[PDB]
């Protein structure tokens with residue numbers, strides 16, 4: 001392994017990765033990264049960037065790993081490698097309370113729907129919704145999406161369910177909002193949970209992350225850390 005592992009993340013996705021009032025990185029994904037680094041016996045440096053810049057930075061060797069709720073998809077596996085699953089991540093729409101909006105073309109056509117640039121949600125929305133006349137608006141980060149939603153510039157927004165719920169709906173800014181319809185399950189677009197994103201040739205680094213991850217699941221550390229954030233099974237299957 002290298003001496004220092006550089007880990008990229010976007011910090012607008014509470015409760016997984018965001019910044020506290022001091023600017024320090026916090027969340028479940030940060031906790032998982034730090035705990036794995038500890039077990040790997042390497043130093044880790046967190047590197048903030050826009051989400052859509054993470055895979056380009058990784059390929060350019062500006063970072064060595066991505067821990068940023070990065071869903072494991074077929075399409076991404078053609079470009080990069082992944083650790084074993086960190087946790088599950090379904091996608092779900094939010095809109096104002098009492099909105100009739102549903103995650104369907106019939107409901108959404110002509111409406112303004114925000115998605116994170118570079119995300120699986122943007123891929124889904126661009127292919128299924130933008131092509132058919134939904135005004136899909138892609139953003140550099142998720143904070144801008146929540147902001148434009150509360151300003152009434154957006155009718156709805158598509159992101160990871162747990163991020164929306166714990167990061168917005170249960171926070172002061174989101175009290176006027178609610179999920180619109182059920183989660184949108186689509187294996188091909190949304191993948192099989194999240195993982196550490198890695199260059200394909202970094203076999204040693206993947207093995208080290210995988211080993212640390214297994215170990216912190218085996219000894220209960222995963223569940224104790226998760227309990228800080230979640231009263232449900234975030235790992236999934």
Ligand SMILES: NC(=[NH2+])NCCC[C@H](N)C(=O)O
Pocket residue numbers: 009010011012013017051068069070071072089116118119120121142160194
């Ligand atoms: N830190 C973030 N903003 N993460 C966004 C992740 C969204 C989705 N899971 C994806 O892999 O595309």
